[PDB]
Design a protein around this ligand. Structure first.
Ligand SMILES: [Cl-]
Ligand code: NA
Length: 129
């Protein structure tokens, strides 16, 4: 599923991400935009052979199991394939655990490089929430 900007904002708000750990909704929408272009089916392989999955490009190195990242962890205790669903619940629950682990949203390289210190509120402008 390729979300619309406001559709995703509403879905994220409903799942508890607005101001989660102090991160306003615009941050999450911005991150999703540049990580996956709002596509729940986005996958990308890293050089170390791990793979990023779904709307927020969660990494198999630490967070999910894909059966092919030897010596990795599964901290969200889910198959990585569950992160590709049109239902974003699993991606959101896992993201809450990542953003809580001490490094905040800096765990998402595109957020750090493309959202952080910008006017993220513009990403939810005009949306009915
Ligand atoms: Cl933080
Ligand atoms: Na893993």
């Amino acid at each position: 599923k390729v979300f619309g900007r406001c559709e995703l904002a509403a879905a994220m708000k409903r799942h508890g991400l607005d101001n989660y750990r102090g991160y306003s909704l615009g941050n999450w929408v911005c991150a999703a935009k540049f990580e996956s272009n709002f596509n729940t089916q986005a996958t990308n392989r890293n050089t170390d052979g791990s793979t990023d999955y779904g709307i927020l490009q969660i990494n198999s190195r630490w967070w999910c199991n894909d059966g092919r990242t030897p010596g990795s962890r599964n901290l969200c205790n889910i198959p990585c394939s569950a992160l590709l669903s049109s239902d974003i619940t699993a991606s959101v629950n896992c993201a809450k655990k990542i953003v809580s682990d001490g490094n905040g949203m800096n765990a998402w390289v595109a957020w750090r490089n493309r959202c952080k210190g910008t006017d993220v509120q513009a990403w939810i402008r005009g949306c009915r929430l």
